[PDB]
Write a protein that holds these residues in place. Structure first.
Motif, PDB file in Angstrom:
ATOM      1  N   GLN B  17      46.203  32.735  43.811  1.00 26.51           N
ATOM      2  CA  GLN B  17      46.127  33.558  42.609  1.00 26.51           C
ATOM      3  C   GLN B  17      47.461  33.609  41.876  1.00 26.51           C
ATOM      4  OE1 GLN B  17      43.179  35.511  41.404  1.00 26.51           O
ATOM      5  NE2 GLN B  17      42.320  33.823  42.609  1.00 26.51           N
ATOM      6  N   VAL B  18      48.574  33.568  42.608  1.00 27.91           N
ATOM      7  CA  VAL B  18      49.879  33.493  41.958  1.00 27.91           C
ATOM      8  C   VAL B  18      50.022  32.175  41.207  1.00 27.91           C
ATOM      9  CG1 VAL B  18      52.369  33.474  42.346  1.00 27.91           C
ATOM     10  CG2 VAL B  18      50.912  35.071  43.631  1.00 27.91           C
ATOM     11  N   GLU B  19      49.530  31.081  41.793  1.00 22.61           N
ATOM     12  CA  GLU B  19      49.568  29.792  41.110  1.00 22.61           C
ATOM     13  C   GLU B  19      48.698  29.807  39.858  1.00 22.61           C
ATOM     14  OE1 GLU B  19      51.393  27.033  41.872  1.00 22.61           O
ATOM     15  OE2 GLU B  19      51.441  26.683  44.037  1.00 22.61           O
ATOM     16  N   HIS B  20      47.555  30.488  39.918  1.00 21.85           N
ATOM     17  CA  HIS B  20      46.696  30.579  38.742  1.00 21.85           C
ATOM     18  C   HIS B  20      47.344  31.436  37.658  1.00 21.85           C
ATOM     19  CE1 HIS B  20      43.188  29.952  41.822  1.00 21.85           C
ATOM     20  NE2 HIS B  20      43.904  28.856  41.645  1.00 21.85           N
ATOM     21  N   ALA B  21      48.067  32.485  38.058  1.00 19.32           N
ATOM     22  CA  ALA B  21      48.848  33.254  37.094  1.00 19.32           C
ATOM     23  C   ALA B  21      49.945  32.397  36.471  1.00 19.32           C
ATOM     24  CB  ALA B  21      49.440  34.488  37.772  1.00 19.32           C
ATOM     25  N   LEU B  22      50.554  31.510  37.263  1.00 18.41           N
ATOM     26  CA  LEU B  22      51.532  30.574  36.711  1.00 18.41           C
ATOM     27  C   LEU B  22      50.886  29.637  35.698  1.00 18.41           C
ATOM     28  CD1 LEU B  22      54.643  30.247  37.389  1.00 18.41           C
ATOM     29  CD2 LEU B  22      53.416  31.609  39.105  1.00 18.41           C
ATOM     30  N   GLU B  23      49.658  29.195  35.973  1.00 17.29           N
ATOM     31  CA  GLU B  23      48.931  28.383  34.998  1.00 17.29           C
ATOM     32  C   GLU B  23      48.681  29.165  33.713  1.00 17.29           C
ATOM     33  OE1 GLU B  23      47.577  25.002  35.289  1.00 17.29           O
ATOM     34  OE2 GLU B  23      49.171  24.985  36.796  1.00 17.29           O
TER      35      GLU B  23
ATOM     36  N   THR I   7      37.145  40.172  39.038  1.00 19.64           N
ATOM     37  CA  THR I   7      38.497  40.497  38.589  1.00 19.64           C
ATOM     38  C   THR I   7      39.531  39.540  39.176  1.00 19.64           C
ATOM     39  OG1 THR I   7      37.670  42.761  38.688  1.00 19.64           O
ATOM     40  CG2 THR I   7      39.965  42.500  38.143  1.00 19.64           C
ATOM     41  N   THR I   8      39.193  38.249  39.268  1.00 19.96           N
ATOM     42  CA  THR I   8      40.039  37.230  39.877  1.00 19.96           C
ATOM     43  C   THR I   8      40.239  36.073  38.911  1.00 19.96           C
ATOM     44  OG1 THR I   8      38.245  35.950  40.883  1.00 19.96           O
ATOM     45  CG2 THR I   8      39.085  37.843  42.117  1.00 19.96           C
ATOM     46  N   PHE I   9      41.381  35.404  39.048  1.00 22.61           N
ATOM     47  CA  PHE I   9      41.684  34.240  38.230  1.00 22.61           C
ATOM     48  C   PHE I   9      40.827  33.050  38.650  1.00 22.61           C
ATOM     49  CE2 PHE I   9      45.583  36.395  36.968  1.00 22.61           C
ATOM     50  CZ  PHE I   9      45.765  35.934  35.680  1.00 22.61           C
ATOM     51  N   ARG I  14      42.137  31.349  34.241  1.00 24.18           N
ATOM     52  CA  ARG I  14      41.205  32.032  33.355  1.00 24.18           C
ATOM     53  C   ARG I  14      40.435  33.087  34.133  1.00 24.18           C
ATOM     54  NH1 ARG I  14      37.693  27.061  31.858  1.00 24.18           N
ATOM     55  NH2 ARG I  14      36.292  28.780  31.291  1.00 24.18           N
ATOM     56  N   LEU I  15      39.948  34.085  33.394  1.00 25.33           N
ATOM     57  CA  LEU I  15      39.034  35.101  33.908  1.00 25.33           C
ATOM     58  C   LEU I  15      37.650  34.784  33.361  1.00 25.33           C
ATOM     59  CD1 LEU I  15      41.978  36.715  33.614  1.00 25.33           C
ATOM     60  CD2 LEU I  15      40.502  38.646  34.214  1.00 25.33           C
ATOM     61  N   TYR I  16      36.772  34.257  34.222  1.00 26.67           N
ATOM     62  CA  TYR I  16      35.496  33.712  33.758  1.00 26.67           C
ATOM     63  C   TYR I  16      34.620  34.781  33.117  1.00 26.67           C
ATOM     64  CZ  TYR I  16      35.536  28.869  35.557  1.00 26.67           C
ATOM     65  OH  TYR I  16      35.785  27.529  35.748  1.00 26.67           O
ATOM     66  N   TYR I 121      41.975  46.019  37.131  1.00 28.51           N
ATOM     67  CA  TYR I 121      41.771  46.886  38.283  1.00 28.51           C
ATOM     68  C   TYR I 121      40.319  46.842  38.746  1.00 28.51           C
ATOM     69  CZ  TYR I 121      46.213  48.932  36.705  1.00 28.51           C
ATOM     70  OH  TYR I 121      47.514  49.123  36.300  1.00 28.51           O
ATOM     71  N   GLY I 122      40.106  47.282  39.983  1.00 25.17           N
ATOM     72  CA  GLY I 122      38.767  47.495  40.491  1.00 25.17           C
ATOM     73  C   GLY I 122      37.974  46.210  40.665  1.00 25.17           C
ATOM     74  N   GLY I 123      36.655  46.390  40.737  1.00 25.50           N
ATOM     75  CA  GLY I 123      35.704  45.303  40.892  1.00 25.50           C
ATOM     76  C   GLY I 123      34.551  45.419  39.920  1.00 25.50           C
ATOM     77  N   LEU I 124      34.840  45.891  38.708  1.00 29.68           N
ATOM     78  CA  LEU I 124      33.843  46.166  37.685  1.00 29.68           C
ATOM     79  C   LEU I 124      33.914  45.120  36.579  1.00 29.68           C
ATOM     80  CD1 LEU I 124      34.328  50.031  37.313  1.00 29.68           C
ATOM     81  CD2 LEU I 124      32.866  48.812  38.933  1.00 29.68           C
ATOM     82  N   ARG I 125      32.769  44.879  35.944  1.00 28.47           N
ATOM     83  CA  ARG I 125      32.697  43.908  34.866  1.00 28.47           C
ATOM     84  C   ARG I 125      33.454  44.428  33.639  1.00 28.47           C
ATOM     85  NH1 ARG I 125      29.006  44.998  30.863  1.00 28.47           N
ATOM     86  NH2 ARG I 125      27.598  46.763  31.225  1.00 28.47           N
ATOM     87  N   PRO I 126      33.875  43.549  32.728  1.00 24.13           N
ATOM     88  CA  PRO I 126      34.553  44.014  31.514  1.00 24.13           C
ATOM     89  C   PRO I 126      33.555  44.573  30.504  1.00 24.13           C
ATOM     90  CG  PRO I 126      34.392  41.655  31.455  1.00 24.13           C
ATOM     91  CD  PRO I 126      33.878  42.074  32.797  1.00 24.13           C
ATOM     92  N   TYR I 127      34.099  45.121  29.418  1.00 23.42           N
ATOM     93  CA  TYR I 127      33.308  45.578  28.283  1.00 23.42           C
ATOM     94  C   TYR I 127      33.121  44.411  27.321  1.00 23.42           C
ATOM     95  CZ  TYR I 127      33.868  50.457  29.726  1.00 23.42           C
ATOM     96  OH  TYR I 127      33.825  51.647  30.414  1.00 23.42           O
TER      97      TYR I 127
END
Lengths: 195, 225, 234, 213, 210, 229, 206, 213, 231
Positions: B17-23, I7-9, I14-16, I121-127
């Motif tokens: 995830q740190v690498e993805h933040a770097l991207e 809530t993960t890259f 990108r945030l899908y 934050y959290g584990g909730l979907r965006p608006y």
């Protein structure tokens, strides 16, 4: 024991206060700097009462106002500053009251030269002239008599000089040293007056 | 995922995830910082659609306190919230010590906050890299660059964002110590213009002095020979 | 179909699976209303050395209100304790006794919070509740794992669903003093269970509970009464 | 106030007056409350405290009675019979009295009520317990008295008591005791309410009488 | 204040005066003290006015919510239990001496709830500053069985006695008859110069049209 | 793939985790309780640890007690069983604290079965791997024995066996009615069943409640067991 | 005694298709010192609702800010002008929510109840929101007794706007001239459905 | 363990809302018609009591509710709607407006679309009511969007019923004409199996009245 | 395994969920905003559900936040209404704090910070909603701000969101001028709404139009657009 005085106008707003740092039956200082809390953006919050409450409340208000002005990148209005200070002083009134007596002053392009009187109970109202302390008993009628709407800076300074002479002559705390603020001509200035 | 590990070790040993933040930082716009004897120059790319978008609203160079400024690259909303946290901590230090926050302290705080966000549960890493510039307790000026990884370092000059390696090389082969304000501004312009097209509107540049962070007018930016 | 959430068809299959779990226990229980009384008759068997007197499906939520749960035994006892707690809370807050209808409403709300929430398993439990309301008339309220309550003139829990409705309709149509009313309601319940199960029933392997205006308290008739009624029917 | 409980052969008789409060606010008050069909309780002290702990204990007794049930088949006066002939599931008097003692003791900083629990069960036969001001329980195997008017009848009841009193003489004794307490005490007055608790049936008597000598 | 209640043949009659004084000075000369809780349950209050008003509103709305949920007629014992449990929780700092009345499946029912959270089923009750005069008239003239009209006259006489003999009680007389089928409320049951133009000087004047 | 959680019913309408807990308990050490003419007797065969010869002789005692007149034994994991037994002791202590009277057996059975059942509902907790015998004897009520299954059920018996080879012990003990047999004459038959279903001395635990223990929990003495062996 | 610190009073009256609200202009200090002589105690909520707050000045300001917040939320949500009775009950509930830590304010609510028939609506409260819905006039403050006497004496039913102004102004000035801690000028505010008239009376300043 | 079960699809859809929409589409039909002087809402084993199975319910004296979807979800949402109306009445001292209640219930329905560990409500609601701003009919979806209607249909075959009512509906109609059109639409989609509720306080028409209409 | 990890890259940084929310907003109805010399103009498109709707009083796109701030919506309506409620709460909170009406930019920053908080934050979907927030303040003047699900906003002179926003932006680029009257701004808004739907004559039955002028907000009644359509 802490005397504060403030005078409004159309081309000025002036503040004045005794420079006495006091504890018990002695004066720590004749050049106290714990009263004036000038804010960036032509604003001032002159406080009286306890030194500790003065420092804590004045720094709290000043750093919060600076936080606003840096977060939003603009100068805070003096009416907004005064009512923010009143709300913050009121929030602690029932919980842990600051025993601080507030004179807010400043300049806005919107509302001109503004001055607000407020007390430790957080009762606020705008005024053309205000004072705090037991010296307020003795320097209020002098402000009433000699104030007119079209004063200049020198006339206001003369009125303040008469107030200082009254405080020397009649008030038992024979206060002789005072520090001023002069907000006029889009500039803030400081002066010191003896006797 | 209120309390879950988003950032975890991969089989090799990295934090993905740190690498993805770097991207995400690599997608961000280009920013450049150059130091001088007692002043700094920060220049950052601008991207505004002509005639429709307000030029002034986008603001990548930000004033943090009396004597610190920031220039980020990455995700804009992340940058805004981090900058608000940084301003809050600047005023908190100035309340708790009665001196303005030095640049090294606040750079360390931003790096610590990013490390905390890469390590706590139920939290995403910051997708931004920052170039803070400011003055120290001993009146000396310096620039601190901070990654999404939580590692910071001081620099004489530095570049972040898209095509950062090219600008870093150009700064390496053109930087000199204690150059004048005009020379520093010109060097920053020709360095950041190695990757972005030659135009006056695609950049905003500011000069940090002990008094204030002045912004260079568009007329002065124009006529760059 | 693991969580209690919607499928592409739109149904929630966890409720259907819980209903299948309730039906798999092969326990039959028939509730019948009367003119001034209500009866529940249940089969009294597990869902040589075992104590067969201890096995029961009926329960006493209150002196007036009673019930009969069918499904998983732990879920049945947990629902019994929830019903008793709900009735006790009502009596404490309001100072008067809850009725069968309101208790069923509250219990199905408690079931629905499990139905909507993914982290909660559904209780494999259906249940009949009976009592007398303040107008001196009987009640018979039935709920299922779906969290849906309904009042019935007569109802069955068990395997023979939408088949015992036919014999219940026939008996209620055929039938359509407090002592004679109670006797006829008990006879109708026993005959309904006998016809549904389709084998002769021994009095030592069924349990009949009665509530009525003559005796407001929920009580279970002894085995001698059930033997007398079985001899009378034959 | 005057609340009395006296044990006699196969039974226990509780008794109380009706007056509440210098100005008599109420003059028909049921101080003897029915916790359960086999268990009653006389109240003294502040009325709000007494009413609240008594209804809390009614709630607790309903919960206990529901949990005491076993699975399967087994085996102007007013009179009632117990639904529980054999006492298969009615809670014991000592259990209710002790949870009341714990309730009053846990909140004894402000609670200022005193209670006399009286009942019957198959284990201990007829039973009397006295819960005091601070929340101390004592089992009174002969008789218990409490209230401001009880002080005037301690020697009278102590002199007149016998071990195995008949129902008639026990009724006369408790009636005369409450009458004497009402005669001597300004705080107690009104009609007398008596509750007689036995193995099978409960009786509730109301008496209107005065003192002449 | 004189609030009063009594119980008649399948009914409960409440009555009260119409005075509210802020010390020696009378503020409202036709105040209302009979409060609607339910269609079959009414009450009257004595003590602190704000606690009375807001406790009565809270009780009315809780009773309406319970009526919607259970879908049966509201009970008097339910209102008594809710009121006593609310009043004891504040330990007498909710100063509300409330006479409750109503009719339900258990017949007519009148209760006197005291500010510390104790209640008492009664045949008649009086509360307020003028409570003793009304109590005297009630104990003089009340009988075991009476009609709607006799009870209405008795309540009116008691409230009038409290009005005349007490300085904290005055004005008109209101009553409410609560029966099983419906209620019936009477607010006035008994009911026992121009300056020139420009006389007042002004400093400034301005008009803005909305 | 419906068996990877206790909080999900399969299409057949069942919880497979509970059945797997049943499988875990069934192939574990053996326990039994029996109700005799004037007492109850509890036996536990710890034969799975016969390979371990280093164990201190007669120290792994699966039999426990509550309030000195309730026996509680188990088949399952030791730690989960200790958790259940500690909850049972806590519930009995709370009942005495409130009411000044020993808890009835069936109320304790219902409470502990509810406690076991509460772990089968949520998706973030492991259900209990233990089946619990809880029993008592009285002069007037005679013996009452309850088996609490891992699924939250609770059933009353006049004799129960669980663990490995439970069918063998059940069919062997279902030959003579022990309600007319003294508890001293039952130890011989129980030992014979253990033989049928050297190490017999040390890998067995015994407990008893009858007249000779004044209707209170006790372990059978060695001098009483040895002539019976 | 907390009301004695700042003083102040508010009055309200009704007429024929017109109402009026009046107040003094002073901020007191330590019960005797006059620090301001323009401290207005009447605030506008909407077109048909006005509030007059009297008591402790800090509590007056906090209560005005809270009521402005809630009224603006109600209006922007519902997209309509808030009814006068609804605002009255909201103020009563707000006052009672602070039952044991009260705001030392004795407010009045003066407005037009619409239906279109512009009826008067006057009501008065205490520090814990005790309803005093009155048909002819409403009074609060430290000068309550003098104002009650003046209004009971001089009130005339169904007056036009001019007569209502003269009556309410005379009542206020007469009440204030016999009060130490209330006066120093007076605002009068006459509402009609079509217009509104603000006037500053020429009063005693001493 | 608070993670949203409803998640954006790659095609920008919250498919759980679509599935709940399919569920309410599978349920029994419901409709509402608004006249100049009224507003009506109506809906479609021989042992179930008709009294205990009313889909049409009352929130307040001038607000009624009906639904299409799951019964238990409707019961909890009805309890919440009644509580919100009661709290508005306790605060502002007047009966709640229709639009405010619809907004509050829409927000509560939208909350479960986003809250972790829960799924959306599997029903669609129809509020009917009267206030000072006239008559009101409001449809609330599983998505949480509130729609203001003149007349509408919800459950099974709602497109055909909407077409029928659209060709039949006029703004200037009476309660008799509106009830006749509602009964016509219900019998087209399909007396014993009809429920009608009209709003003067909200009312439920008995089977005799519906038979007369 | 039930967690979708919203809530993960992504591997591409990108945030899908955010991009899914944006392309969901692209499928919503069209919204337009612009600024003139007298006031800020906003307008929208109505997705015809039926003629049996109470269109008389139906603004499902433009909403009032305060007498100086209003917004136009593009996205999910149920997600937009809660954010509009939050905007109103923050406006009245600022007025309660500082005794002064809020600036537009501060409110935009607050709501976009809530959006960022949901995306971090959290584990909730965006608006999944975008706002065109128009308003007036004395500090800056007339302002228009566009927002996104990502919490990233930008100020504009005239812009569009929703379906076919490229065509609307092209028309705005072609026609918009710095000095424009209110009538000219309304006519340009009508032209852009027409060209977005590929219709020369716009349908008055499915156009919402409103504006703010220095403060007063006008919501054009369904009859008022008809005068502008003919002109």
């Amino acid at each position: 024991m802490d005397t504060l005085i403030g005078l409004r106008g159309n081309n000025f707003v002036v503040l004045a206060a005794d420079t006495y740092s006091i504890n018990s039956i002695i004066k720590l200082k004749n050049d106290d700097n714990t009263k004036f809390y000038d804010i960036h953006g032509n604003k001032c919050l002159l406080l009286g009462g306890s030194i500790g409450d003065r420092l804590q409340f004045g720094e709290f208000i000043r750093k919060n106002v600076h936080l606003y002005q840096y977060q939003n990148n603009t100068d805070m209005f003096v009416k907004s500053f005064a009512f923010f200070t009143r709300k913050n002083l009121a929030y602690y009134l029932r919980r842990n009251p600051f025993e601080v007596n507030c004179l807010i002053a400043g300049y806005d392009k919107k509302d001109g030269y503004q001055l607000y009187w407020c007390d430790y109970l957080s009762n606020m109202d705008s005024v053309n002239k205000g004072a705090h302390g037991y010296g307020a008993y003795l320097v209020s009628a002098i402000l009433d008599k000699y104030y007119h709407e079209n004063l200049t800076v020198d006339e206001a300074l003369d009125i303040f000089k008469l107030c200082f002479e009254e405080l020397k002559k009649r008030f038992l705390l024979t206060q002789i040293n005072y520090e001023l603020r002069i907000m006029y001509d889009n500039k803030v200035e400081t002066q010191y007056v003896t006797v | 995922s209120y309390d879950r590990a988003i950032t975890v070790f991969s089989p090799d040993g990295h934090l993905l995830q740190v690498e993805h933040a770097l991207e995400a930082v690599k997608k961000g716009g280009c920013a450049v910082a150059i130091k001088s004897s007692n002043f700094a120059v920060l220049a950052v790319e601008k991207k505004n659609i002509p005639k429709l978008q307000n030029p002034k609203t986008t603001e990548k160079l930000i004033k943090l306190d009396e004597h610190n400024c920031l220039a980020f690259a990455g995700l804009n909303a992340d940058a805004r919230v981090l900058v608000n946290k940084t301003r809050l901590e600047c005023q908190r230090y100035y309340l708790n010590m009665d001196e303005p926050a030095p640049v090294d302290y606040i750079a360390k705080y931003v790096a610590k906050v990013q490390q905390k966000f890469t390590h706590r549960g139920g939290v995403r890493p910051f997708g931004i890299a920052t170039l803070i510039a400011g003055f120290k307790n001993n009146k000396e000026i310096c620039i601190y660059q901070t990654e999404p990884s939580g590692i910071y370092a001081a620099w004489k000059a530095q570049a972040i964002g898209k095509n950062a390696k090219i600008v870093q090389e150009f700064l390496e082969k053109n930087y000199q110590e204690n150059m004048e304000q005009k020379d520093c501004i010109f060097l920053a312009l020709k360095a950041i213009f190695e990757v972005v097209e030659l135009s006056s509107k695609n950049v905003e540049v500011a000069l940090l002095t002990e008094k204030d962070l002045t912004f260079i007018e568009e007329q002065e930016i124009n006529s760059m020979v | 179909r693991h969580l209690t959430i919607f499928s592409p068809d739109g149904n929630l299959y966890q409720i259907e699976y819980a209903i299948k779990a309730v039906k798999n226990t092969n326990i039959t229980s028939v509730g019948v209303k009367g003119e001034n009384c209500a009866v529940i008759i249940s089969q009294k068997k597990m869902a040589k050395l075992l104590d067969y007197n201890n096995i029961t499906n009926i329960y006493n939520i209150t002196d007036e209100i009673g019930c009969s749960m069918v499904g998983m035994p732990g879920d049945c006892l947990s629902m019994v304790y929830k019903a008793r707690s709900e009735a006790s809370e009502f009596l404490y807050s309001n100072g008067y006794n809850v009725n069968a209808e309101t208790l069923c409403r509250n219990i199905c709300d408690k079931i629905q919070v499990y139905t909507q929430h993914a982290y909660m398993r559904l209780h494999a439990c259906s249940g009949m509740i009976i009592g007398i309301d303040e107008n001196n008339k009987p009640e018979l309220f039935k709920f299922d794992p779906s969290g849906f309550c309904a009042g019935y003139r007569a109802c069955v829990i068990g395997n023979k669903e939408q088949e015992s409705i036919s014999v219940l309709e026939r008996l209620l149509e055929k039938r359509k003093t407090i002592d004679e009313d109670i006797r006829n309601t008990t006879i109708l319940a026993i005959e309904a269970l006998q016809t549904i199960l389709a084998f002769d029933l021994k009095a030592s392997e069924i349990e009949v509970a009665i509530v009525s205006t003559k005796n407001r308290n929920f009580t279970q008739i002894s085995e001698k009464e059930i033997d007398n009624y079985l001899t009378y029917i034959a | 106030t005057t609340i009395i409980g006296i044990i006699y052969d196969n039974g226990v008789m509780l008794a109380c007056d009706s007056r509440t409060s210098t100005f008599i606010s109420n003059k028909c008050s049921r101080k003897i409350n029915r916790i359960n069909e086999n268990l009653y309780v006389c109240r003294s002290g502040a009325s709000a405290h007494s009413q609240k702990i008594i209804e809390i204990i009614k709630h607790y007794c309903v919960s206990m009675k529901n949990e005491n049930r076993k699975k399967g088949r087994f085996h102007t006066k007013n009179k009632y019979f117990y639904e529980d002939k054999f006492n298969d599931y009615n809670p014991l008097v000592e259990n209710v009295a002790h949870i009341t003692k714990k309730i009053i003791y846990t909140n004894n900083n402000f609670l200022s009520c005193a209670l006399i629990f009286g009942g019957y069960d198959k284990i201990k036969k007829q039973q009397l317990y006295a819960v005091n001001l601070n929340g101390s329980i004592i089992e009174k195997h002969d008789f218990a008295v409490s209230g401001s008017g009880s002080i005037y009848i301690q020697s009278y009841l102590q002199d007149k008591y016998k071990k195995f009193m008949t129902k008639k003489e026990c009724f006369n004794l408790i009636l005369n005791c409450v009458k004497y307490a009402m005669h001597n005490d300004n705080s107690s007055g009104g009609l007398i309410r008596i509750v007689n608790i036995t193995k099978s049936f409960v009786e509730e008597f109301t008496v209107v009488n005065t003192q002449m000598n | 204040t004189t609030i009063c209640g009594l119980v008649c043949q399948n009914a409960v009659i409440l009555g009260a005066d119409t005075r509210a004084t802020e010390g020696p000075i009378v503020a409202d000369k036709n105040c209302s003290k009979l409060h609607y809780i339910s269609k079959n349950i009414w009450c009257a209050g004595a003590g602190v006015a704000g606690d009375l008003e807001h406790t009565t509103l809270w009780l009315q709305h809780n009773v309406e919510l319970h009526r919607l949920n259970t879908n049966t007629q509201p009970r008097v014992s339910m209102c008594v239990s809710r009121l006593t449990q609310e009043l004891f929780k504040y330990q007498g700092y909710k100063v509300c001496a409330i006479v409750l009345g109503g009719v339900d499946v258990n017949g007519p029912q009148l209760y006197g709830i005291h500010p510390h959270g104790s209640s008492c089923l009664l045949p008649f009750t009086a509360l307020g500053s003028g409570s003793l005069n009304a109590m005297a008239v009630l104990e003089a003239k009340y009988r075991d069985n009476m009609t709607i009209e006799e009870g209405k006259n008795l309540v009116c006489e008691a409230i009038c006695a409290g009005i005349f003999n007490d300085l904290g009680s005055g004005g008109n007389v209101d009553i409410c008859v609560i029966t099983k089928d419906s209620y019936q409320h009477i607010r006035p049951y008994k009911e026992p110069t121009i300056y020139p133009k420009g006389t007042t000087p002004i400093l400034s004047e301005k008009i803005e049209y909305i | 793939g419906y068996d990877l959680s206790v909080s999900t019913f399969s299409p057949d309408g069942r919880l497979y985790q509970v059945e797997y807990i049943y499988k875990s308990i069934n192939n574990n050490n053996t326990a039994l309780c029996l109700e005799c003419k004037d007492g109850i007797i509890c036996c536990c065969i710890n034969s799975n640890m016969d390979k371990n010869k280093m164990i201190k002789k007669n120290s792994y005692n699966r039999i426990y007690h509550v309030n000195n007149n309730i026996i509680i034994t188990y088949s399952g994991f030791d730690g989960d069983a200790r958790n259940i037994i500690d909850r049972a002791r806590s519930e009995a202590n709370t009942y005495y604290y409130n009411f000044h009277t020993n808890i009835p057996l069936h109320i304790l059975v219902n409470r502990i079965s509810l406690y076991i059942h509460a772990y089968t509902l949520y998706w973030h907790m492991r259900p209990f791997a233990a089946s619990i015998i809880i029993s008592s004897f009285n002069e007037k009520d005679k013996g009452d024995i309850y088996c609490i299954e891992p699924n939250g059920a609770c059933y009353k018996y006049s004799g129960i066996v669980i663990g490995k080879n439970k069918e063998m012990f059940k069919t062997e003990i279902e030959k003579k009615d022990y309600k007319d047999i003294n508890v001293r004459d039952a130890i011989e038959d129980i030992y014979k069943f253990i033989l049928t279903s050297n190490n017999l001395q040390n890998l067995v635990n015994f407990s008893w409640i009858c007249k000779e223990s004044s209707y209170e929990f006790q372990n059978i003495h060695e001098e009483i067991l040895t002539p019976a062996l | 005694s907390i009301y004695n610190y700042n003083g102040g009073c508010v009055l309200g009256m009704s007429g024929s298709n017109c109402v009026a609200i009046a107040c003094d202009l002073r901020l007191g200090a330590n019960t005797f010192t006059t620090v301001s002589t323009k401290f207005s105690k009447i605030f506008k909520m909407n077109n048909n609702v006005y509030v007059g707050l009297s008591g402790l000045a800090t509590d007056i300001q906090t209560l005005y800010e809270i009521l402005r917040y809630r009224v603006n939320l109600y209006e922007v949500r519902q997209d309509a002008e808030m009814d006068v009775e609804c605002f009255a009950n909201m103020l009563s509930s707000i006052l009672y929510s602070n039952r044991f830590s009260p705001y030392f304010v004795n407010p009045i609510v003066v407005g037009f109840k619409l239906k279109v028939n512009y009826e008067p609506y006057l009501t008065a409260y205490d520090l814990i929101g005790a309803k005093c819905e009155t048909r002819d006039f409403v009074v609060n403050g430290v000068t309550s007794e003098q104002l009650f006497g003046m209004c009971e004496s001089l009130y005339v039913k169904d007056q036009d706007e001019n007569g209502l102004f003269e009556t309410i102004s005379q009542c206020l000035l007469s009440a204030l001239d016999r009060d130490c801690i209330s006066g120093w000028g007076a605002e009068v505010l006459v509402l009609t459905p079509e217009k509104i008239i603000k006037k500053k009376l020429k009063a005693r300043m001493d | 363990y608070s993670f949203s079960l409803t998640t954006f699809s790659p095609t920008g859809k919250l498919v759980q809302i679509e599935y709940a929409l399919n569920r309410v589409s599978s349920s029994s039909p419901a409709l509402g018609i608004r006249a100049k002087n009224g507003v009506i809402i109506a809906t479609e084993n021989e042992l179930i009591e008709e009294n205990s199975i009313f889909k049409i319910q009352q929130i307040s004296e001038h607000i009624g509710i009906v639904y299409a979807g799951m019964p238990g979800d409707f019961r909890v949402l009805l309890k919440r709607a009644r509580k919100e109306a009661i709290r508005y009445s306790l605060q502002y001292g007047s009966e709640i407006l229709v639009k405010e209640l619809v907004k509050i219930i829409a927000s509560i329905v939208q909350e479960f679309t986003q809250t972790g560990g829960v799924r959306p409500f599997g029903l669609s609601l129809l509020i009917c009511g009267v206030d000072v701003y006239g008559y009101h009919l409001y449809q609330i979806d599983p998505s949480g969007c509130y729609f203001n209607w003149m007349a509408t249909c919800v459950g099974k075959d709602y497109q055909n019923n909407m077409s029928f009512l659209e060709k039949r509906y006029n703004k200037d109609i009476e309660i008799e004409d509106a009830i006749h059109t509602a009964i016509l639409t219900l019998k087209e989609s399909y007396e014993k199996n009809i429920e009608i509720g009209v709003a003067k306080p909200f009312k439920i028409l008995t089977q005799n009245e519906i038979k007369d209409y | 395994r039930y967690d979708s990890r919203t809530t993960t890259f992504s591997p591409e940084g990108r945030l899908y969920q955010v991009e899914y929310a944006l392309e969901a907003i692209n499928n919503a109805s069209i919204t337009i905003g612009l600024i003139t010399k007298d006031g800020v103009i906003l307008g929208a498109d109505k997705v015809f559900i039926s003629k049996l709707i109470d269109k008389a009083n139906n603004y499902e796109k433009i909403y009032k936040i305060d007498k100086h701030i209003f917004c136009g919506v593009a996205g999910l309506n149920a997600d937009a209404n809660i954010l509009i409620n939050q905007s109103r709460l923050y406006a009245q909170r600022y007025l309660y704090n500082y005794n002064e009406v809020q600036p537009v930019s501060q409110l935009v920053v607050q709501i976009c910070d809530i959006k960022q908080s949901y995306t971090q934050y959290g584990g909730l979907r965006p608006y999944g909603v975008s706002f065109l927030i128009g308003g007036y303040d004395t500090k800056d003047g007339y302002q228009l701000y566009h927002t996104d699900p990502s919490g990233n906003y930008s100020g504009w002179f005239a812009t569009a969101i929703g379906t076919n926003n490229l065509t609307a932006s092209s028309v705005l680029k072609q026609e918009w001028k710095n000095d424009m009257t209110l009538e000219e701004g309304l006519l340009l808004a009508l032209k852009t709404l027409a060209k977005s739907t590929d219709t020369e004559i716009p349908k008055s039955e499915k156009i919402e139009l409103a504006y703010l002028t220095n403060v007063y907000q006008k919501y054009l009644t369904e009859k008022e657009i008809e005068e502008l359509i003919k002109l």
